[PDB]
Amino acid sequence: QARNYKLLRAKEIRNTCTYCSVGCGLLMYSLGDGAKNAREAIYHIEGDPDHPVSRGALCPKGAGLLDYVNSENRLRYPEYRAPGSDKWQRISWEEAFSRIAKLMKADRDANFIEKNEQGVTVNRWLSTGMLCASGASNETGMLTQKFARSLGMLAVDNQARVXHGPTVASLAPTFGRGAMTNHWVDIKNANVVMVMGGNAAEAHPVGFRWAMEAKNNNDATLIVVDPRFTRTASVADIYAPIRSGTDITFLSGVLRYLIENNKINAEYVKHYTNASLLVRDDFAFEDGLFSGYDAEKRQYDKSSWNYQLDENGYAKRDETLTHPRCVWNLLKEHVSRYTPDVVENICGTPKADFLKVCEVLASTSAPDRTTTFLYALGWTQHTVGAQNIRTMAMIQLLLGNMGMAGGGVNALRGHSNIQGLTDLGLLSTSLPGYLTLPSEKQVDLQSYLEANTPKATLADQVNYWSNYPKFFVSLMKSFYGDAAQKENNWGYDWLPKWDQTYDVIKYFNMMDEGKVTGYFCQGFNPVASFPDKNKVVSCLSKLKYMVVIDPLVTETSTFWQNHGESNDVDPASIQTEVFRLPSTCFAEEDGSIANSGRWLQWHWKGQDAPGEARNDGEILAGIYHHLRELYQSEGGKGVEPLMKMSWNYKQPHEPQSDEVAKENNGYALEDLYDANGVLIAKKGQLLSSFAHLRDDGTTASSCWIYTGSWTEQGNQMANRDNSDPSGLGNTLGWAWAWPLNRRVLYNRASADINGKPWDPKRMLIQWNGSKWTGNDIPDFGNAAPGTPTGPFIMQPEGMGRLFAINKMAEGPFPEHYEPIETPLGTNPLHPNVVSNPVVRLYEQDALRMGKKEQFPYVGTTYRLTEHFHTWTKHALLNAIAQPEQFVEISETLAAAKGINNGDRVTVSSKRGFIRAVAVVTRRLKPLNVNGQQVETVGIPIHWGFEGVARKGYIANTLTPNVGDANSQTPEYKAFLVNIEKA
Amino acid sequence: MSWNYKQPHEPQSDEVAKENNGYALEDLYDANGVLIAKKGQLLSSFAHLRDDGTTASSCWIYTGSWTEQGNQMANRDNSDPSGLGNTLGWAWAWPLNRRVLYNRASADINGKP
């Protein structure tokens, strides 16, 4: 008979995939029953059938986890690379901690800035910066936030900077919050699934099962719009091509089509958006430029981008929508230039295909039909990234799809925990809970609070950010405890104050000028992931010291080592001291991570880490306690802010995940009473809602949107009830979502002004005569139907913005601008303004930009389903599935260059080159754009110089060092290259 | 002598364990007039035992072992939050789940460890 079942007596542990943001459940199997004498070893991993999103399924990345956990390239011991050396030397943990602390202290004491030139206390340290791990837990993230900020760091970013920064920059201004609005299983309710700006069948495969459920079992139409015919196109009902960098034209064309045919949800638009508000008379737009442009600073004065004010100080309105200055009529005028011929001329999308998409989208303007948009980097990674997103969001507000089951904006996050690190604020000027560090002009608490607490711009609105001071003071009580009191303004002056944002491109520009001494890379591989790799390696080489913390060997850790054409450097010329510290991976600790749907999910430890690897919090605590002890005995600069940060863990060298998770939830520091004199919480108890946070020092929380995650009822992130009573796929008992377990944001819009569902088969919330109740937790207060209170409760006007007032850097309405490296060399809509007029482009990077005479083809970079960044090439299973680097090109271009399928080619740009196998296919086809034939060369990003797959070249050797005008997110998706036979 | 078991020829372990823990024989109130236990309920601490005939316990140091919260001797939480190997959630120790006797001496006269 068959071999026996190999897991019958193994230890079974629950955990969550460590790669993308779907958050699939895992069941991991270890050799050993947990007895103290058996050292557990994970030997198989499969899916958890009870998880509501994955239901047992795992894509090739999650299914291959065993080979990542047990990779031959797992890091085992602390290693050190001496200046000008060509080899690693093994050191002890205590030597690593003491050498790093000494280097840090010397640099901090030399360059710490206590006061700025205007006399304000700013306590900031700029010569050492940090990259944080979006693949590590939320408890690691909060420890990293405390470590960084208590030292005064401002150059602190996580992957959000090169990823979904633009989403937050456009979705927050439009709807009030920057996160994905619905959740994976909810996509099954859609009537139309649009995959544009994303490739969900390859980038989020197990979450995409729900789009296949809507197509196959809800009769939905799946549409893919992309320069390439991808694996998501394989299963699509409609495929339409589009030139990289032209989404705003296509989407603005869709707005013009909807308005012109009156394919809108008119009552939704009239009440839930700002359509009826009146805009200042001085607002204008002409020939590519909005009013207020200052051509020398390349920035706009946004004074005119605002509403007209009434007598009470509120925005003026015209409910009939006939006034020439209402948002609705200015929107109509703005998009009138984007006709179907203009879309075809700029995007290259055939009019017949563009028409099919417009007609299907238009069918969801009915109240009981919805479109859901699934997108990610195809829209964010541009110099107009944020504006791409604004256009789509506007479409969803015209169709009335926000707040509906099967509707919304599913901005699919990337890393497993990029949503938690964004929530915890590991971004230059951020604090946890979407709070902001003080700017250096805000000289006291009162100024700071006033700048961050918005006044309502229409009467009768929830305007929930009016509670900013309760969140802020609670954060300060979490950080400083008894040291933060009313008398010292809750420790206000201990936080670093910023003079500007220290985004990654800027900070590498400072590193190139010799202003950066040290850098930490915690679970981030910038040699692979940052634009213009040859410049990145040059900038890192000027560092005096680098600390890498990771479970695997990365290209970044070996940037000083010669790897031939892949990394042609001279070790003897690089003086950086490099510390490589071996950390745990997802399977070797307990903790939480937040998926794309905002679900905070707990996971448990299945084995110890290999060798002398330690957990991320233990590595930060080693360095931190050595450093703070040096300050205790030698003194130095910025002593107080550093020494006042709390580190209240039972074992200070080993902070536990539950202690940190509980601090994020928050506690009552005194007994708390409601207005009726009823006890709401006792001193010492975990809080059950952010509604109980106060601004008087009686409450603490290091992450206000996380209040409710771990209460007196227990760890809600460990809840495993997959019940779905409505049949809509909403499982309120599985894990815990922020905010307050609301799974579908903006769900008051799922009903009309009288409280009646737009679609009676999809009721989310309903009015019972005194409260809202239903199949989801209401994202709303208790305003009764018929009152003026808008459903977007974080917006000061309570509405979805069609016109984004003064929030966007380049305009309150989106406008087409070409990529910095464009194949046309001009912009057919307005040749006087080719590219975004507010883009920041450093002079050194401007010299490294190419033109179409030398680099005639559009270059774009993207992912393949089988690999995750340059991480899974260290896993044998994934290396077998896609072993060797390739690039994709059309049959037409291959014939022109005499390239046969499978031949080697050389792909180059103004910054460098890569060599690879050529995949020649009809899936890529030239498009007719502005009288030219434009070809695209496709460059997957998974290969490099470390790993078990065949050695290749970093794709970022080709990409430009320029980014979105709002978040500085690099333009990785549209640039210019040349190709030659090799 | 009492032999108050549901089957007198086969006294059950839980009946005897509950007698060792002890019971409130009348409703019991603290000095502030707050109910501490109802008549018939298992006591939660020997602090609630009285000398007036309103409480019973056949083993006062065992009060807390099996309360209204259940059999504490069956608790199986091996958590050790301090790292010192103290597992207050595994089984139940006398007296009142104190695992290290004389632990006020683990600090000096001012309370410092």
Ligand SMILES: Nc1nc2c(c(=O)[nH]1)N[C@H]1C(S)=C(S)[C@@H](COP(=O)(O)OP(=O)(O)OC[C@H]3O[C@@H](n4cnc5c(=O)[nH]c(N)nc54)[C@H](O)[C@@H]3O)O[C@H]1N2
């Ligand atoms: N398989 C796999 N999964 C991933 C990842 C991975 O490494 N491997 N990474 C995770 C991360 S961190 C992220 S943020 C996500 C992103 O996930 P996605 O953004 O979906 O994935 P990409 O492949 O980067 O890009 C999507 C598509 O953009 C198309 N495209 C190129 N330029 C343009 C253009 O300007 N407009 C339009 N409309 N489309 C364009 C590309 O051809 C590609 O099909 O993936 C996550 N999931």
Ligand SMILES: Nc1nc2c(c(=O)[nH]1)N[C@H]1C(S)=C(S)[C@@H](COP(=O)(O)OP(=O)(O)OC[C@H]3O[C@@H](n4cnc5c(=O)[nH]c(N)nc54)[C@H](O)[C@@H]3O)O[C@H]1N2
């Ligand atoms: N050309 C081009 N460039 C891109 C993009 C693109 O489409 N085009 N996409 C961009 C985006 S959206 C992103 S997110 C990036 C990502 O690029 P990166 O995030 O730098 O790349 P990864 O290879 O995903 O690196 C993650 C590291 O985390 C380590 N990690 C795993 N778990 C832990 C842990 O528990 N703790 C620690 N300390 N380490 C851990 C892994 O070993 C791995 O080394 O690439 C970006 N760059």
Ligand code: SF4
């Ligand atoms: S990579 Fe994403 S889709 Fe694949 S198993 Fe992991 S979490 Fe699921």
Ligand SMILES: [Mo+6]
């Ligand atoms: Mo990403």
